[PDB]
């Protein structure tokens, strides 16, 4: 199929079949654990096309990152796929899975740097502003873990992934350490025990950055 | 039809026939040849200068294609054509039938490299001359066409793959003929590799091979012996 | 000028090829180094304002501990533990986890990453030795020209 | 995973979460709007079906041709043919 | 030019001879010949 | 007298074969060692007349630092840095680049060159093991004669 006509092969792989509750052939192959089918160049080409969304495949990591950091200065001067066009370009660029992956990476990298700074700098006698920001960020992460948990293909599939297990360890470590500090904020011993728990938190957070 | 430009009107009948082969191949759907000539950004004579009637009806002339292939090889490709030798006044010359053959073969050879028809290309390569240099040129044109902007597309993938395969095969041919030369007489093979060819602004075959990025030719013992 | 020689020249081409494996090792090693460094520096010196010395403490000892130079006497001195046994009889009980963290860290870096790098180097060498010889033969003309 | 995940990063993903929760509340309780999608036509479906069936036949023909050009199969076919050749000489010699 | 053309012809003749001495080509040529051999027995048996 | 034995004899032939790889490593290592040694000795002791001690300082510490013996306490003492953190609160700001130079140097020598040598040794061993057995069988007659 890929030898004869690549576009029709891609259309065939994207076609929803009624026999498996209206979902495509790659999803069927993944559910059947067919490594040979998934490792094939045609399937990988369709997956890469899905990755970049409505963008050209020649875009590099730095180009998409620069466009992410400078939305109004790099997006009109690129080729891919005036409220009719600028809004269309914004909805196509920011609906792509690659852009969402890059946003999650940058977000997790700041989380690692900010949390690393928080553990290295001394704790104050009250709950600091950076502690409140990290509290809001980890509740949001916990809600995101619950949202993925509800809409996945079961609890076993979610707990099978090692990164989800790492996510649970992070959220759990931060909340123990935070409540340990927040129980008695002026107590020096509480700060020391809280930083001891948060040492484990920073180790898991950077390990989690390898995803 | 007759044209006021003297360069286009000087062309023989077989050049117009090669132009007809290019036109019929170009009229086919999703043909990379029409897209390649459109993206070349050249005039009717192939010069990079960017009326309208002449530019579409005679868009696939041999001179323009020669210029496109010339930019594709390197910065100093320049085929010297002499269409005056096909007149009846040069019939008394002894070796004229070979040169007319060789030149004709070369033009058809380049066309067959462009459509990626390897067997017919190899056959036109065998009839003409300058075998080693033409094989290097064939390898260079197929590799550069394979990574060109005109060949990206869903339908050209298999074609692209075929181009790299054919490129490797032509490289092997260039190595093989070279090896045969070194087997027969090493001094003549060295003299052949040191010979300056007019088609690449008077510089030798090893320099051509280096410009074509032919690692197999450069790694061969004959070439290494000349370099030492 | 080593490139003319038949022994040193392909090895130099091989060295530039192995630089990618070295870079891969650096990217994998950076994760453990920064994680262990932030954790270890925080455990050794708590209730301290962040400064440039904190950053130097994060970077200095974890990088040089993967080459076998263990700063355990120096780490023991910084931990303020006065016992004959090293990480015992300390002022704070949290600083006693520094050898455990270190034990995990050098297990991650020396036992796993260094040996993984040896495997990548051996595989890479077997893959690109003939290509290095061919590339050296092209560089022979480059040097001659 | 990143097809279904909201675009907004982690400090600001709470806005996306409350927006989806707000939409969920408006589908279960309010019911003032609905969901729209696109369904593939029968023509393009039959085109994909015809394409897939044709390429299935092409791969099987190519596969049979490739297995007949293998060395073991060619030696085996040559062997059976030489056996059939003696049958024919037995017939020729009998007639002589 | 004469030397290069002559060695081009020599390499192609040697190359064709080398590909005909390969095991797959010899088995294939033997196979086609045995097919032509049955054609000849069909003719012989018809004449008998 | 190890050559009569079927285990020690081919290994000795193998050892002389691996000496070329050792020499190749020495030639590659000499570049970083001399470069880092001149740079490091100049940064540690500036405004000093050249003497034999300068040459010994160029050669002594860079060679022994590739075997894991890091002279960081000794380097720290020579740098005249009085801070609790080692290469901080120094008289000159230039001498604080000595760990950075060292960090690059042992990355070049231990991570890259030593592992490269392991790859060359493994490849060399697989190439010349049968030849070593054959050469041992010729040396069997040589010893007998
Ligand atoms: C699964 C992994 C990542 C989590 C490990 C659990 C960590 C966070 C917990 C488990 C046991 C805990 C320790 C238990 C007892 C003490 C003694 C106290 O005087 C200081 C804190 C200290 C030293 C705790 C530090 C944090 C600690 C090490
Ligand atoms: C998977 C990994 C995290 C295994 C977990 C093991 C960790 C949590 C264990 C291993 C060694 C342990 C430490 C050993 C000794 C002491 C001294 C004691 O007076 C307080 C707790 C403390 C400081 C322990 C804290 C928890 C500890 C760090
Ligand atoms: C086969 C190998 C992996 C064995 C593993 C060794 C582990 C279990 C050993 C090696 C070094 C040990 C640490 C050495 C020193 C201390 C300080 C002490 O105050 C508490 C326990 C603690 C933190 C030890 C915990 C256990 C430890 C990490
Ligand atoms: C490719 C290589 C060369 C990377 C370049 C990084 C070099 C130039 C950087 C990395 C670490 C840096 C040093 C880090 C800290 C200090 C202390 C400061 O008070 C003066 C500058 C000084 C001494 C820096 C000089 C520049 C330095 C050596
Ligand atoms: C994954 C690996 C490669 C991480 C790389 C570690 C590098 C970036 C680290 C390790 C040791 C560090 C040096 C340790 C000590 C000092 C002295 C200080 O006064 C200035 C910075 C300086 C000179 C550091 C510069 C950065 C440094 C060279
Ligand atoms: Mg998750
Ligand atoms: Mg010829």
Numbering used by the authors:
A (entry chain A): 676 to 756, 787 to 916
B (entry chain D): 483 to 532, 546 to 723
C (entry chain D), F (entry chain C): 917 to 1061
D (entry chain A): 1062 to 1157
E (entry chain D): 1110 to 1157
What does the paper say about this structure?
Before the onset of hydrolysis (substrate-bound state), both MHR1/2 and NUDT9-H domains are occupied by ADPR. Within NUDT9-H, the adenine group of ADPR is sandwiched by the indole group of W1264 and the phenyl group of F1372 via π–π stacking. The terminal ribose group of ADPR forms multiple hydrogen bonds with the side chains of D1330, D1426 and R1428. Three Mg2+ cofactors (Mg1, Mg2 and Mg3) are bound between the two phosphate groups of ADPR and two acidic residues on the Nudix helix, E1386 and E1390. The extensive interactions between ADPR and the NUDT9-H domain strategically anchor both termini of the ADPR molecule, exposing only its α-phosphate (Pα) to solvent and making it readily accessible for nucleophilic attack. Indeed, we observed a putative water molecule bridging Mg2 and Mg3, as previously found in the crystal structure of NUDT5. On activation by Mg2+ ions, the water molecule is deprotonated by the catalytic base D1460 located in a loop close to the Nudix helix, and is poised for nucleophilic attack on the phosphorus atom of Pα. Although both Ca2+ and Mg2+ activate the channel, the Mg2+-dependent ADPR hydrolysis of srTRPM2 is inhibited by Ca2+. This is because in the Mg2+-bound active site, the three Mg2+ cofactors are closely coordinated around the α-phosphate, likely inducing a favorable geometric distortion around the phosphorus atom for hydrolysis.
We investigated a TRPM2 chanzyme from choanoflagellates that integrates two seemingly incompatible functions into a single peptide: a channel module activated by ADP-ribose with high open probability and an enzyme module (NUDT9-H domain) consuming ADP-ribose at a remarkably slow rate. Using time-resolved cryogenic-electron microscopy, we captured a complete series of structural snapshots of gating and catalytic cycles, revealing the coupling mechanism between channel gating and enzymatic activity. The slow kinetics of the NUDT9-H enzyme module confers a self-regulatory mechanism: ADPR binding triggers NUDT9-H tetramerization, promoting channel opening, while subsequent hydrolysis reduces local ADPR, inducing channel closure. The structures of srTRPM2 exhibit a characteristic TRPM architecture, from top to bottom, a transmembrane domain (TMD) layer containing the ion-conducting pore, a signal transduction layer consisting of MHR3/4 domain and the C-terminal rib helix, and an ADPR-sensing layer consisting of the N-terminal MHR1/2 domain and the C-terminal NUDT9-H domain.
